[PDB]
PDB file of C-alpha atoms in Angstrom:
ATOM      1  CA  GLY A   1     -31.157  -1.981   9.290  1.00  0.00           C
ATOM      2  CA  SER A   2     -30.808  -1.295   5.572  1.00  0.00           C
ATOM      3  CA  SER A   3     -31.000  -4.103   3.014  1.00  0.00           C
ATOM      4  CA  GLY A   4     -27.583  -4.324   1.385  1.00  0.00           C
ATOM      5  CA  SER A   5     -25.344  -6.733  -0.513  1.00  0.00           C
ATOM      6  CA  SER A   6     -21.574  -7.220  -0.654  1.00  0.00           C
ATOM      7  CA  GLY A   7     -18.794  -9.698  -1.361  1.00  0.00           C
ATOM      8  CA  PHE A   8     -15.459 -10.344  -3.058  1.00  0.00           C
ATOM      9  CA  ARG A   9     -13.551 -13.239  -4.620  1.00  0.00           C
ATOM     10  CA  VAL A  10      -9.813 -12.552  -4.784  1.00  0.00           C
ATOM     11  CA  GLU A  11      -7.712 -15.544  -3.739  1.00  0.00           C
ATOM     12  CA  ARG A  12      -4.142 -14.303  -4.172  1.00  0.00           C
ATOM     13  CA  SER A  13      -1.293 -14.766  -1.695  1.00  0.00           C
ATOM     14  CA  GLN A  14       2.484 -14.327  -1.779  1.00  0.00           C
ATOM     15  CA  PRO A  15       5.247 -16.546  -0.331  1.00  0.00           C
ATOM     16  CA  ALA A  16       7.464 -13.612   0.636  1.00  0.00           C
ATOM     17  CA  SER A  17       6.513 -10.057   1.601  1.00  0.00           C
ATOM     18  CA  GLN A  18       8.703  -7.434   3.271  1.00  0.00           C
ATOM     19  CA  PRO A  19       7.171  -5.651   6.290  1.00  0.00           C
ATOM     20  CA  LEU A  20       5.976  -2.129   5.490  1.00  0.00           C
ATOM     21  CA  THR A  21       4.766   0.377   8.082  1.00  0.00           C
ATOM     22  CA  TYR A  22       4.485   4.114   8.722  1.00  0.00           C
ATOM     23  CA  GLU A  23       7.729   4.033  10.706  1.00  0.00           C
ATOM     24  CA  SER A  24       9.539   2.727   7.627  1.00  0.00           C
ATOM     25  CA  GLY A  25      11.431   5.374   5.681  1.00  0.00           C
ATOM     26  CA  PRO A  26      12.261   5.554   1.956  1.00  0.00           C
ATOM     27  CA  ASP A  27      15.017   2.976   2.433  1.00  0.00           C
ATOM     28  CA  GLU A  28      12.400   0.322   3.193  1.00  0.00           C
ATOM     29  CA  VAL A  29       9.642   1.664   0.942  1.00  0.00           C
ATOM     30  CA  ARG A  30      11.833   0.846  -2.056  1.00  0.00           C
ATOM     31  CA  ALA A  31      12.442  -2.679  -0.764  1.00  0.00           C
ATOM     32  CA  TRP A  32       8.747  -3.437  -0.278  1.00  0.00           C
ATOM     33  CA  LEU A  33       8.082  -2.560  -3.919  1.00  0.00           C
ATOM     34  CA  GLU A  34      10.964  -4.625  -5.295  1.00  0.00           C
ATOM     35  CA  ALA A  35       9.841  -7.541  -3.127  1.00  0.00           C
ATOM     36  CA  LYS A  36       6.591  -7.644  -5.101  1.00  0.00           C
ATOM     37  CA  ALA A  37       8.420  -6.982  -8.370  1.00  0.00           C
ATOM     38  CA  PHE A  38       6.055  -4.211  -9.463  1.00  0.00           C
ATOM     39  CA  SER A  39       8.294  -2.343 -11.906  1.00  0.00           C
ATOM     40  CA  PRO A  40      11.857  -1.004 -12.297  1.00  0.00           C
ATOM     41  CA  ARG A  41      10.393   2.490 -12.637  1.00  0.00           C
ATOM     42  CA  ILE A  42       7.810   2.545  -9.846  1.00  0.00           C
ATOM     43  CA  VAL A  43      10.452   1.152  -7.491  1.00  0.00           C
ATOM     44  CA  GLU A  44      12.770   4.116  -8.050  1.00  0.00           C
ATOM     45  CA  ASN A  45       9.903   6.606  -8.275  1.00  0.00           C
ATOM     46  CA  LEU A  46       8.152   5.436  -5.108  1.00  0.00           C
ATOM     47  CA  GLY A  47      11.434   4.278  -3.604  1.00  0.00           C
ATOM     48  CA  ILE A  48      12.223   7.864  -2.643  1.00  0.00           C
ATOM     49  CA  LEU A  49       9.078   8.587  -0.629  1.00  0.00           C
ATOM     50  CA  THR A  50       8.778   7.775   3.075  1.00  0.00           C
ATOM     51  CA  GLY A  51       6.376   5.322   4.683  1.00  0.00           C
ATOM     52  CA  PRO A  52       3.490   7.800   5.038  1.00  0.00           C
ATOM     53  CA  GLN A  53       4.490   9.923   2.044  1.00  0.00           C
ATOM     54  CA  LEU A  54       3.880   6.844  -0.106  1.00  0.00           C
ATOM     55  CA  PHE A  55       0.618   5.643   1.437  1.00  0.00           C
ATOM     56  CA  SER A  56      -0.535   9.254   1.127  1.00  0.00           C
ATOM     57  CA  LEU A  57      -0.564   8.727  -2.640  1.00  0.00           C
ATOM     58  CA  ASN A  58      -4.072   8.044  -3.942  1.00  0.00           C
ATOM     59  CA  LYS A  59      -4.989   5.659  -6.760  1.00  0.00           C
ATOM     60  CA  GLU A  60      -4.982   8.523  -9.263  1.00  0.00           C
ATOM     61  CA  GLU A  61      -1.585   9.639  -7.966  1.00  0.00           C
ATOM     62  CA  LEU A  62       0.028   6.193  -7.993  1.00  0.00           C
ATOM     63  CA  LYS A  63      -1.380   5.814 -11.507  1.00  0.00           C
ATOM     64  CA  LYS A  64      -0.005   9.210 -12.527  1.00  0.00           C
ATOM     65  CA  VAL A  65       3.538   8.218 -11.562  1.00  0.00           C
ATOM     66  CA  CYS A  66       3.316   4.456 -12.071  1.00  0.00           C
ATOM     67  CA  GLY A  67       1.103   4.979 -15.105  1.00  0.00           C
ATOM     68  CA  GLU A  68      -0.919   1.801 -15.570  1.00  0.00           C
ATOM     69  CA  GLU A  69       0.982  -0.403 -13.119  1.00  0.00           C
ATOM     70  CA  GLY A  70      -0.065   2.008 -10.387  1.00  0.00           C
ATOM     71  CA  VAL A  71      -3.536   0.470 -10.344  1.00  0.00           C
ATOM     72  CA  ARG A  72      -1.837  -2.696  -9.099  1.00  0.00           C
ATOM     73  CA  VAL A  73       0.418  -0.926  -6.598  1.00  0.00           C
ATOM     74  CA  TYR A  74      -2.547   0.792  -4.951  1.00  0.00           C
ATOM     75  CA  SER A  75      -4.465  -2.491  -4.840  1.00  0.00           C
ATOM     76  CA  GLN A  76      -1.608  -3.941  -2.792  1.00  0.00           C
ATOM     77  CA  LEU A  77      -0.932  -0.813  -0.733  1.00  0.00           C
ATOM     78  CA  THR A  78      -4.441  -0.421   0.679  1.00  0.00           C
ATOM     79  CA  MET A  79      -4.354  -4.090   1.673  1.00  0.00           C
ATOM     80  CA  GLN A  80      -1.315  -3.385   3.849  1.00  0.00           C
ATOM     81  CA  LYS A  81      -2.674  -0.134   5.282  1.00  0.00           C
ATOM     82  CA  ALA A  82      -5.773  -1.877   6.630  1.00  0.00           C
ATOM     83  CA  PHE A  83      -3.549  -4.555   8.163  1.00  0.00           C
ATOM     84  CA  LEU A  84      -1.424  -1.882   9.840  1.00  0.00           C
ATOM     85  CA  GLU A  85      -4.451  -0.032  11.213  1.00  0.00           C
ATOM     86  CA  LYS A  86      -5.125  -3.024  13.463  1.00  0.00           C
ATOM     87  CA  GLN A  87      -1.485  -3.762  14.281  1.00  0.00           C
ATOM     88  CA  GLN A  88      -0.860  -2.058  17.623  1.00  0.00           C
ATOM     89  CA  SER A  89      -4.098  -2.062  19.620  1.00  0.00           C
ATOM     90  CA  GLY A  90      -4.087   1.232  21.498  1.00  0.00           C
ATOM     91  CA  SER A  91      -5.790   3.988  19.520  1.00  0.00           C
ATOM     92  CA  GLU A  92      -5.964   7.304  21.374  1.00  0.00           C
ATOM     93  CA  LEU A  93      -9.220   9.150  20.696  1.00  0.00           C
ATOM     94  CA  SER A  94      -9.015   7.973  17.084  1.00  0.00           C
ATOM     95  CA  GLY A  95     -11.282   5.900  14.861  1.00  0.00           C
ATOM     96  CA  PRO A  96     -14.302   5.938  12.524  1.00  0.00           C
ATOM     97  CA  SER A  97     -16.091   9.291  12.706  1.00  0.00           C
ATOM     98  CA  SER A  98     -19.322   7.965  11.201  1.00  0.00           C
ATOM     99  CA  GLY A  99     -20.625   4.432  10.756  1.00  0.00           C
TER     100      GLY A  99
END
């Protein structure tokens, strides 16, 4: 019960998008990047990390390795993460600590 405002206007979709999950190793992580066509550098740089190892990278990190492009990579990554969170309904004693 606390007055608050929110919203977002980002209408952007892609025709093709390779499936990326935590079970996907570095062999797939590199494919996901190329699929989006981020950059020839970020693909090889982030194409060596595993599924989780990559997602583990924070905005600052992704920006440190991907430089400026990173900002975009992270914007797309998070989007996927959230989608994965609610992929296989069956969380075991896991969830939001505080709401």
